[PDB]
Every structure is written in structure tokens, then in C-alpha cells.
């Protein structure tokens, strides 16, 4: 019993959303055109070490409006997307909910492992023949996360070509470092990486690279260690690339923050049937580019075999790991927080029994070889943040404002039309700000911003939907981020810890980036209607739609003429009620003031809004309420013409303007 | 005929309880993080000897809630799950009920030794079957208990690095100890270990170490000793690991207190065809860690062989040997009631015939290889007590009070409808405190609790449950602990002298720990809702249910707002409903303090209680009864909000919340 | 529900496949004729050492056709069936699937040795049944593999007379070899034999040669060793032939590479009632050919006795030991894909108990007595690969290509209807070549291929098929070979450095050799017509079928006339059939080169291909697709002639052409 819900569901059924394969196909293979620090210009030559956490590759995209009837031409705007590309952040949390993390099934690792432990094992420990005690939990997650981090290191070094280079292996290990200095990469204020040169662990009897080793032979003993066990044939253990891959994984695991390092120990250790190949501990210049690449390949093969050859969750965890160092940069001065509350993947210490003999499959294009995986991971994340944006805004702007002496019992005041009763909260400013998990959770549980999310994600990803959905929900539940009174100034990565202040002391907490990108990519988009082609506009009625609780963005008939001469086009007068009583009218802006209008007068000096061109803040709630207005016309015609807007962006996907939406017709 | 019990049984059948194997598997590789003393904090450098009997390994677990559609920030709480770490108690008692202790069948042992004797042409008297049956039955129980005790000593001495350790063996054999000094690993008030260096028995003719030895000679008379006989092949008697294991057990048995060295003699006799290797008592440091590890492995091999290759009863007894060192601590004021009443194991002196020529089953994951055997052993006990709590709190909170005018009036004198009429007991304080056994014995044997406890245990364990049920029934049926009126303060391990009296002098004898742990583990949970995720409270009805005796712990809205609202959201006024004489509404707290409510006032001015976030004492029995009360809200429709709760405990298992319950 | 598969199964059932025995019988007495190097020609005098790893024994086979009613003389072609002769590879891997390796039952061995021990009054411990079951299972697999390797070494050294031979034993024991020199029979780059003279183990107290010896004494303890025990009667331990055989095996086992001497220890222990004869290591020439022949015979007798008198599994393992020297070579450009993926045998270390008092079954025709064991062993492998090829090429040619724009587009991008949609794979060349295992594993496990491969193998072999099926499935499921883009040139044995890229970079991974051999042998043949006798072609329809993707090898008329006509017999013109817009007919070759056909022209000017008489590459996948083409003849009705083909191969068997097929 909800007409809007059923209408939207039927629409989404009519025009299925574009599954992610198109996004991957489009983004996989273009190099960035130019990379520069977010605020300013790049220097002549890049410094020795990435040290300013603002460098961001950007993706230009512009809009030009064009129409006859206006006084002068309209200047073009630059809707460009940015990618953080330097700053670090955590993404792994221990919390969980039912679907947040699942354990794989060792239904094809147990037969072989038992048949290989029954024969080559001293004939005095007894016959095992039970195939039921080999039931340790199967959680091969953290390996993929570390793999992703390693790929991220490689990509970050490639993009920001430093002046004096070093081999990726050399930079990662950091042989020629100082006592407690930062690694060659990731050396800045926010950097979180174990400093100092990496230390090889020890010179024990049974070594097989960085991890422990146990053999199964007659004149020996057998005792499976506690962590994970990767049972492999003697052929590969004595191979070369595999040893290098193990060393690389170990190396990237010891650069995590010390505390998080203690939480999730690197417990891998291999068991086979041949003599232990002593640890090699490469140093100075043993590993080189091609050898590293070969090791990466073999490692990917190993991980795929560990995942029961799933390759869709593998790519998921790999993306999530690579996301600690690449991520989209917000676009609105509000502060770019919608991402910060959706970035956590639950995890558990790795464990289980794994057997690896061959390949069992071949994937045409794995993530680790696609010409800068960082960008593709960042955009793969953005294509989800935008869907979340679309679902939250399904009802209204969902503002959160500040008022002094607000009741510390309930924080729900009605703001007027265009803001549904549920949303539109308020909070005292002089006390610590709210936690921002006290709103989102309340938003994504209702059976209107839930089913939409369900079906949209289902169409985007298909069978491997639940995992993402479940996980993101968990992220929302425990997010410590808080709302703040500051601005990002649109040329920063983080709020400058000075005294930026809000224009209206309020924050809209459901906008992350302009919906135009959502339309272009084909994903779901809401509210705001698309602007790419000829449009019939009726100012005399569009403006009316505005003052009764709209937003200017839908009203592309106004922005065109905002200061091109709208003045001598339309007048506003209080009301001409021919009967009961001649009362006067007024309107309320996003602030509290309720300045009124008494007589006929040109519109240009009653509202007088800032003119950006044809790209205004979509959820700014310019006017909340207004009663008693007429909007007379002051020119025959000249208020029922045409307008043409052209937007060309480099990320136009395959099915660009054929996606579901429910913006006013 | 009872409907509630039928409903509970049906629900339990439909939703099976979690198998024990998951709980075992999820602890094998748990790394502890806190080893602080229970009360204070770790000193800079660890001592040289385990003296303060207050240390505890703390399994931290955090819960924090949030008020959806509000700007309030409730501080996060802490589920402090404490495991006692240095304190000695006894879990052995020679008193058994019919099913308590079984007799492992010697079906596969007698024929092998018969054939051995026949092959080596030894002249024995009488068919070995009847002589085995009457002369020596087959009870190997003891030899597993000592093994568990040894593992526990190792684990204890490992976790608490005493600033200059020696070895497992050097702190066990008491080399360089004064004749009155206590062993290094256990030196504190009221310990349970004999002191001074242990003395090896005199070297007689034939010895296989610390126990007698008898060799079987061709064409020569053979007569068995009186204890237990462990026939072995000659290849093993000359092994170093075997003798080292034997020595370690002998040492562990001569360290338990003096009086139990004359009731459970460690009698054993190795029999083989070798030449008596003679005892080679290790004297100086000569038992290195790898040698001790090999000793433990071979020992577990022999033990598992003796138990007819069962590995389940063996695991049970090995664990029961460990609680003598590692115990699960209580989480309430008047604790040490459930654990103190379920620890004993019925036992018989070690005797019978055994045979070990080679191992047959390869146990993949024995106890002693876990990350820390103490923790694994303690958690299983915790599960047992959790289920026992679940069954006990099936029909109320089971209060016991100390009212001076106890004789003048009968029971149900003070406890209104809250405490189910039939589960409240009183006793005048002139006499000493009663014996807890009296109450628990009557509690357990009611058909309603029996028929459910049996099913729960059977689901948890399976074919091996009956031993555990019988043993716990015996233990609870045999307990000397008294319900002492004093308090524990929840910041100690042993009750300190001079502690203050309990709250209202009413001990509650069901609680041992919060049920959230039981929910997380996926085991049977009592009638408490699981604070897991999104909740939709309604403060009016919720509050009304409280004043009918219900537990505040089932009221989420109140706990969330305990000090952040409820002074501007809800009021209390007397009911003026009919035209009859107006009456002053009143409600009765636990101690019989009838409280009158004459003039309507904000709730926070009529009733109070400490704010523990959302973790309040489950069965605190706050309001016994109330009559004539009304609750009206004074907020413009924002008294029906939503809350979110997150419980990220580190001991969550596979069956997260799939376990049965009473009030879903 | 699948009709094609049902038809194939019905046809296979109606026409049984040839039993393996005929193939074995038709090779026992085959005399090879050519021993030239694969590439060049035999030098005047043979070398003194086997170095060039390119020699091959060539089984020549000739086919020549004739155009009935014509004066043309097509030159005779040559089915070059090459058998690699000096090249070492490994066919051992410790990785098994459930049916891969069985455990021969010790039903008839334990009782005999039990009775022997009882008769000789030896004091043993424990009934031998359970000790056999747990302490030592019965896997004699290894000792047959070494025997096969020894036979193979003999055969290799025999065929290639190295201009001054010494003996089987003098080239095996490495007498007079430098500490770095390699053994005479195997001295070349990337060999697989340990170098230098082999060193005898030290002479201890009791030895029956190169292995330990234990005698059973009346009224004396007896304890078995840890490896395998081979009880024998005293009459044999003192025999010369037995010890010579034992020495030969020991020598062969110490010559295989160093790293497999520590994973498959040659552990054995003779047990008897004699006096330890002591090791008598032959040192100078003292193993004459007749003595070695006797050694081999007695050895095969003992082996057959150990295998429960099976002689089928024994033959299989003996053969599998030989391919390590003799392999069947490929007959295509991108070969070494099928044989490289089906060679491994799952194995377990040698152990258990055995008993040999006298032979019981007299195998008439053992392997080692054949004219040349290498050839006989290689041919059986060839049969296995032939059947495997037959099953693989059941639904198309299974192409794999290297297109740079692989990611941008999905599969079926280039391969028209010719390559069954679902059997074409691509990969960008930026990454290294994929693993062949990935493709083959998916190929084999489809139900359609499984249900036919099983039946084919069962018909060929019988009760012993399941071992072979399981072992081949394991091997193919475990292969490290990569699909390297390079070419082989068909005039070598090992891929030479610097060879040119493949044709269109598209490897085809079904072909191993021409199906005419499979037809002749009477085994299952893929969907290729057998060019046997009189044929009645019709060039028009035949040519039309080609341009629908069919294989040119099924078009006899075209191949016969490839360069003798088809420039004056048939023309190609665009189809002008309807009144719609005329369109330029086009056809697409393998590499996606769309070819337009605008003006009608003689066929030889539109399409070309090399003339190999009538033996063209079977699955070359010439024309993927074509649309809008017409074929009209310009000869006065002499385009429907007859042809004759004669295939007088020297390895024809009884079931000449009675085997099943797909397109009869």
C-alpha cells in the first residue's frame, strides 16, 4: 500500500540497471590524462617521496547550455571527478552480522589432503581414515586483502612517478632506510605504516620462505600447526616464483600498523612431502620487475584455487583491500562523509586447510593486470556509493540543522514541505556533534529504502549480491564519524583544521556527488531529472513548483535566465483573492528569517539566488515554505521557449541514458 | 499436560542446539590479550614466583548501543569475562551415583596379552578372563586426571612468565628447594601442593622408572602385581620419551596434597620381555623442552590406547583434571554458587590390565597442542554452567532471603507475583547460613527441569552426554558450600574478609554470568531477550510490564534512557478510573519496602537504579509487585523510538544466534 | 535426452572395440627398420656414447591414391609414426584421487608366513593380522616400476649400438667413470640420471645383498624391520640369479635423480632361515648376458608372485616404468599437449609383507621377452592417447587463440559456426601462456565425454580399466605444461630455441596424431572418414560442405585434385538468387581475415592450401564461415569421378576397420 514504491519497482523492472561488467569494460583500459595536487599546480619534477596527501588524478567533464532569447551567452561549468590516490585509511573491522562474512566449504580440499596424509606418514601414529577431524574453519579472506594492498602499492608508485625510482621490491622491503624512517612511498603526516627496514624473522631448522614448514615422512613426526595449512606437492614448493610470492605477501603484511598487525597475525605455514627449502630472504636487488610480475601471477593462481574458484568474492576482497589507498573524493563543501560510513569489511583471522595442485580455471582479465588497478577499484566503489545516494534521497533532502537550546529529548522538528516528517532533525551546536550512525541506520531499515536497495544491487551484481549488501549495512551500524561545522572548500582532501563555517549552519547528509554521473553510468538515480538534450520549460509554472517546496536543479528553466534577464520576465504579487480579505504573503528560506512580500515587484530583488550556470546544489532546500503568491507574467510569451544542454564526459558507459529513475515527468 | 514445557521442548527439537565441536574448534587458536591481576594492574616487572592468587586472563568483549533519531551518546559497556588463573581447588570425590562412573570394557586387551603370554611360553595360573573380572577391574580414570593436571601446570607457568623461568621439569621436580619452601609455580596462601623437593623411591632390583617392573621369562612362573599392569612391546621400554613421560606423571602425583597420596595410590607396573632398565631419575637440568614435548606426545598416545581409543571420555577427564588450576569466574555480587556446586568427578582407585603394542588412531588435535589448554578447558566448563543456569532459571529467579521473623510467617510472605510462588525461601539469621545443596538438590529433581536438562545435554554432547549428566547430578547432590550472606564486590577472586552485606540480604542462586554469552555461543538461553540488533521499543507498555514483576533486562527502552530521559518523557500518576474511594498507588521493592505514590511525579523521582548502559543485572528482581498505577507520556509522540545494539564479542561461534530460547 | 550421444553409445555397443590383447600380440615380434635421427641421417659409425637426444625408431607407413579414369600420378605420401628413443622424462607424482591407486589384498600371504613362523618356533609378538593391517600395508607398486625402468635401459642400449658396448651391467654400475662423468647409456643435456659410479652401502653384520637380512631362529625373538619383508625359502637365498636380480634393481634405483632417492627409499629386507649370505657386490666384469637373462627371469617370477599372480596390473606398471625412456612422438606443428598431460602414475612408498616359496603361474609371454620392449610399451601408450583424442574431438576442434583485444570482447568473437560455440578460448598475449590443465580439466568432466570415455576404456581393457581411467583423470587433472605459442616444426623432438610463431597464433589442443592409425588398430575413431578403399566423390556438394566449417580431411575429391585440377573443373561466383540488393560474397579464414569474393574466378585463385596428397591435417579448421557463395562446374560432366586409396601400414591388426566411429 504505497503507490510510489510500486511505481518505482515496476519502473526498475521495465528498464534493468546495467550490470557491473560494462563499468569494468569501460574503465579497464584508459590511462589518466593528468594528475596534479588537488589545490594548486604540480611542481617541475616530482619529489623523492610521496609526501603531500592531496595528489589526485582528475577526470574533466563539462556542461554547456545553449538557447536563444537571453541577453548574453552562459559560461560553461566543469563537473570533474577526483580520486584521492595518496591518503591512507583503515577498512577492516572485527564486527559482524549474519551475512557480513561467510566461511567457504572445504568439500574439495579434504579428499586429497586426507589421501595424502594417510600414505606418507610414519606407520606408527595410527591410521587416520576418519575424514571428520579435518574440519577447521575455512576463512581465506585476509590473504586477498593483503594481495590487494600489494597491488595498491605498485599502482601508487607507478602513477606518481617519483624523481629517483627504486625497484618495487626494494621500496617495499626498504633495505637502505633509517632507524625509524617512513618507507620510500607513504611518507606524510597521515601515513600509517610500520617504519624502519623490514626484518626477516629467524634462521630455524624447517624454513620455506617467510612462513613455517612441516613435512610428513616415515622417520619424522606429524603435528599440524594451529594456523592455516596450505598442502602443496613437492614440485611447486621447490619452485621459484611461489617463494617470491610468499615473501612479497609477508613483506606487505609487516607494513600494517603495529596494533592491527598484532590483531591479525600472518599465520600461514606450508606442509609438503619434501625437504624444506631454506628461506632465501631476498635483499639489495634480487627481485626485479619481471620476477615480481611472475610472482604476482602465481600468487593470484594460488588465491583463486583457495577460494573454491569463485573469483567474484575474490575480486571483492581484493578491491576492498586496494581501497585503503584509492577512493573517490567528494564534490560538495558539506564535507564528503557518505563514503566514510560505508567502507568497512568484516574479517576474521585466517584459518583452514588448503590444497593446491593445479589451476582449475583461467580468468581472461584478473584485476591485478588492468592498467592501474587503483582507478578501477575506486570507480567500482563510486558506482556503489552513488546507488546508496539514490536510495537515501528517495524521500527527501534529509537535512540536519543547528539551533541553540534544542530539546535534549527529541530532535525531530517539521521544516515544511519538501522535507518529509521523518527526516529534518536538529541539534544543539555548543555540545559535541551527533554520531551520524543515529540517522543512517534509521534510514536504511524502512521497507521503502530497503527493497529498492535490494533490487538495485541485485541487478548490478546478480548472484553475488547479498555479501555486498550485508556488508555495507554492517558498516553503517558501527561508524564513529560525526557531523562537523566546517567545509572542504572543494580544493582539499580533508577539512582544513581552521575555521571554515557553513553558510546556513546546516548539513545535508545524503548527497555525495552530482547525480549527472549516476545517469551517465546507467546506475539508478532519483529526484533530480537528467539534462542532456532539448527541453520545454514553463517558467510561470516551474517557478510555482519551486516555491511550494522544490529544488532549483529540477527547474532548469530558471537557472538559464537566473541573471540573463529573468528580472523583466515575471513579477510576484501577494495574492488577488476577489472576496474575503486582502492579506499579504511571505516565504521562508533555509534559515529562520521570514522576510515578506507586499506589492508587485520584479523577481530579481525578492529572491536573488547565486548563479552557477546549469549545475546548482541539487539538495540545498533553497525555499522551505511560501503561502500567498501569484507569479504574474509581464511579457507575452518570452516565458515558454526551448533550451539545449550538452554534457560530454569521458566515462560515458555503454548503456548511458537507458537506466531506471523516478524523477518528476 | 504442562503447556509451557511442551512448547519449550518443541522449540528445542525444531532448532537444534550447537554441537560442542564448534565451541572446541573456535578456541583452539585464541590468543589472550590481558593478563592483568583481577583487581589492580600489572607491575612493571613480573615477580619471581606465583604468589598473588588474584591473576586472571581477561577475554574482553564490548557492547555499545545508539538511540536512533537522537543526539545522545551512551558510553560503551564491557562484558568482562574473567578466567581465574592462579588458585587451587579440588574436583575429586569418592562418591558415585549409578551412572556416574563406568567401567571401560577390556574386550580388546585380554586376548592380546593372552596370546603374548602363550607365545613367550610363560607359565601363568588360571584363565586370564575370570582373574581379570574379579581380581582387577579396568578403571584407568586416574591416569588421565594426572595428565590433565600436568598440562594445566605447564600452561599456568607458561602464561605468567616469572621473570627467570627454569623449565617445565625444573619447576616441577623441586630441584634446589628448601625443605619448607613451596614449589615455584604454586607459592601462596592456602595452596594445594605438597612442599619441598620430591623424593625418589629407593632403587630395588627391577624397575622401569618410578614404578615396578616385571619381566616374563620362558618356562618360568609369572605372577601379576596388585595394581595395574601395562604390557608393552620391548621396543618401547627402552625409549627415552616413554620413561620421561612416566617420570613426569610420577612427579605430578607426588606433588598433590599429602592426604590424597594415601587414598589414590599411583600404582602401576610395566610388564615386558626386556631386561629391567632400572630407574634413571633425572637429577640436574636434563629435560629440555623438546624432550618434554616428545614425552607428552608419547604419553597421550599411551593414554588414548588405554581408553579403548575413545578420545571423548579421555578428553572429558583430561579437562576435569585442569579446572583444578583454571576456573571460569562469576559476573555478579553473590557469585561462586554454580561453579562451586558443579565441579566434582566421581572416581575409583586405578587398577586392571592394559596392552599397547602400537597406536591405532591418530588424534589430529589433542588438548595439549591447543594455543593454551587452560582456556580451552575453562570454556567447556563455562558451557556446562551456562546450560545449568538456563535450566534453573526456567520458572523464575529463585531468591533466598534472611528475614528475622522467618518462623512467625510462612514463605511467599514477601515475594509478590514476581518470584514464582514456590521458588522463594527464607531463613532467620540467628542460625548459620543453610547449605546450598539443600536447595539445589530439590531444584534439579523436578520433572520439568529434568526432562529439559537431559535433552539439552544430549543435544550438546550426544552419545557421551549421560556420563556428564550423571556426574553433574552427583556433584550438585554432594556440595558442602554455604550461602554466606557476605558479598564479593566483583573486583576480587576470593571473598575478602570484612566485605559488606548483600543487597537486601537476598541472595539469588541462579545467576553465574550474563546470558549474552550463551546466546553468542549458540547454546540454550534462559528467558532473556538477546540484545543483538535493531529494536523497536514502546516505553509505555514496556514500563507497564516491568511493574508486573518482569525483569528490567527485557526492557530496552528504559535502560537506554535511564538517565538521558524519563524525566521529561513519562510520568506516573495514581489511577482514578472508577468512582470508588481513591487509593494511593504503591509498589513494593525487593526488601518489602512498600513505597507509596500519592502525587504524580516524573518517573526518575519515584524509582531509581544505576545505569549500566544496556547491560543490567539480569535477574535483579527489582519490583516485586505494584497496584494502582498509571503511566502517561508528556512528549509530543517521540517515546516510541528505535535503538541499535552491537555485540562484537571475540568468542562468537558459527551458530551465532540460532540456539533455542523461551521468549523469542 | 541428447540424441547424438545416444546414437554414438548405441553404435559402440553394437560394434565392440578391439581388445587390447590383439594389439599386444601383433607387436611382440615387430622388427624395426629405421633408427635414423629424427632430423638428419645416421652418421657413418655410431658414436661411443648416447648424446644426441634426437634419435627415433621410425615405423614407416605409406599411402598412395589414384584418380580412376585419369592420367594423373599423385606422388605417394608417408605416415611418419615416430617413437622418441633417447630422452628422459618423469611419470611419477605423489598425488592420487580415490580410485587412482589400490591396495593389493594380503589374503594369501599372511597365513603362509604365519604357518612358517609357527613351524620354525620363532617367538613373535601379536597376531600378524592386525600388525599387518596397521603397521605395514601392502603396496608393491614401486618394485615393478624399477623393473620396467631397467628393461627400458637395456632396450635403449641395445638398439643404439654405441660402437663398443660393454654389457647391461657394465654400463649400469658405472665401472671406470669419472666422479663427474655421466653414465654411458644417458649422457646429454638435461638428462635425468645421477652421475658417477654408484657406491655400495657398507657391509654390516647380516646382509642378503644390497638390502638388510633377518633370519628367524628357533626359540628366539623375532622383530620385523620398517620397510617391506619378503619371506623366502632357504633354497633361493643362496641362488646366484636371485641376488643378481636384487643387485640390478638396487643399481637402477641409485641411478635415478638425487631428489627422488629421498622420497621413494628402496627399502627391502629378505627374511629366511639360512645363514646371512652377506653382500657380494659384483665389481669387475662378472655379469655375463646369460647370467643377466636368468636374473631378469627370476626377478619377474618374484614380482608376479608379489602381485597376487595378476600379471595385468604388473604389466601396466612395468610399462608405465618404461615411458620414462620410450615415448610416442606427435605428428603436428603444436604437439606435446596430449602425451605431456597423460603420463603420471599415482604412487605410495613401498612397504608390507610378502611370501614366495615357489612360482604358481607360468606367464607365457612376459614383457621383457618381446622383440623390443620399448616399442611394445610405447604402442600401448599410443593407444591410450588415441582413445583420449577420440573422446576430446567429439564436438569440434577445441581451438585456443591469442587475440590482443581479448578483454574487450567475449568468446565466440572470431570462431564462426565451425568451432562449436562453447569450445573456443582466447587470452591476451600480454600475460604468460595459460595452463593447459585449466582447459583439459573442464573438457574431461563434462557428462557427454565422461560417459563415452568410460565405455571405450572398459571395452578396450575390461575389468582392469577403472585403474587406467582413474589414473589418466588424475594425471590430466595434474599437469604443469603451458600452451606456449611457439612452434615445433615437426622435424625435431624437443622444441628448439628461436622457432617461429604458430599459424595464426591459434593452438589446437585435440590433435596428437592422424586418426588413420586409430582406424587401422581397430580402436575408437573420431569423426573423420577412413580413407581406405574406393570412394565416389562429388566435388560440388563436397566443396559446399567445406564452406560450412567442415574439415577438409573429409573431402576426398578436393584433396585429390588440389593441384591437378580445380582450375578448370569448378568456379566460384556470388549468388544472384533473389531480386534484393546484390552483395559481395565473403568467407572468413581462421585468423578473422574476412575475404571478399566479388568477381567469379577459378577456385585456385580464391583459396589455396598446401598439397599433402590425401593426408592433410585433420582439424586444421580452414574456413570458419562463408555467406553468399555459389559453385558451378565448367567441365563436361567429369567432376564426379572415382578415386582409389591404399593404406598398407605395417601395424595393422585383426580388427582392421571394424571399430566404431561417428560418421560412417
Residue numbers in the entry:
A (entry chain B): 37 to 701
B (entry chain A), C (entry chain A): 37 to 700
Reproduce text from the manuscript describing this model.
Clinical Tv isolates are frequently found infected with one or more strain of the double-stranded RNA (dsRNA) Trichomonas vaginalis viruses (TVVs), belonging to the Trichomonasvirus genus within totiviruses. Here, we have determined the structure of TVV2 by cryo-electron microscopy (cryoEM) at 3.6 Å resolution and derived an atomic model of its capsid. TVV2 has an icosahedral, T = 2*, capsid comprised of 60 copies of the icosahedral asymmetric unit (a dimer of the two capsid shell protein [CSP] conformers, CSP-A and CSP-B), typical of icosahedral dsRNA virus capsids. Among totiviruses, the single capsid layer is responsible for protecting and sequestering the viral genome while facilitating RdRp activity and the egression of viral mRNA into the cytosol.
Subparticle reconstruction about the I5 vertices improved the resolution of the decameric complex to ∼3.6 Å by the same FSC criteria. Using the molecular modeling software Coot, and guided by secondary structural element predictions from Phyre2 (33), TVV2 CSP residues 37 to 700 were built into a single decamer subunit, denoted capsid shell protein conformer A (CSP-A), nearest the I5 vertex. CSP-A was used as a homology model for building residues 37 to 701 into the alternative subunit (CSP-B) situated further from the I5 vertices. This A-B pair constitutes the principle icosahedral asymmetric unit (IAU) of the viral capsid, and model quality can be observed based on fit in the cryoEM map. Analysis by the Dali server indicated a root mean square deviation (rmsd) of 1.4 Å calculated between all 664 aligned Cα atoms (Z-score = 47.7) of the pair. Notably, we observe an unwinding of α4 and α15 from CSP-A to CSP-B to accommodate the interface with the adjacent CSP-A subunits. As noted in the planar view, channels spanning the width of the capsid shell are located at the I5 vertices. Closer inspection of the decamer model from the outside reveals the residues lysine 157, arginine 159, and asparagine 255 from all 5 CSP-As lining this channel. The channel measures approximately 9.2 Å in diameter nearest the capsid interior, to 12.8 Å near the exterior, and this contrasts with the 16 to 20 Å I5 channel of TVV1 derived from a lower-resolution cryoEM map in a previous investigation. In the TVV2 CSP-A we observe positively charged residues (R74, K523, R525, K539, R646, and R653) arranged on the cleft exterior generating a positively charged region similar to that observed in ScV-L-A.
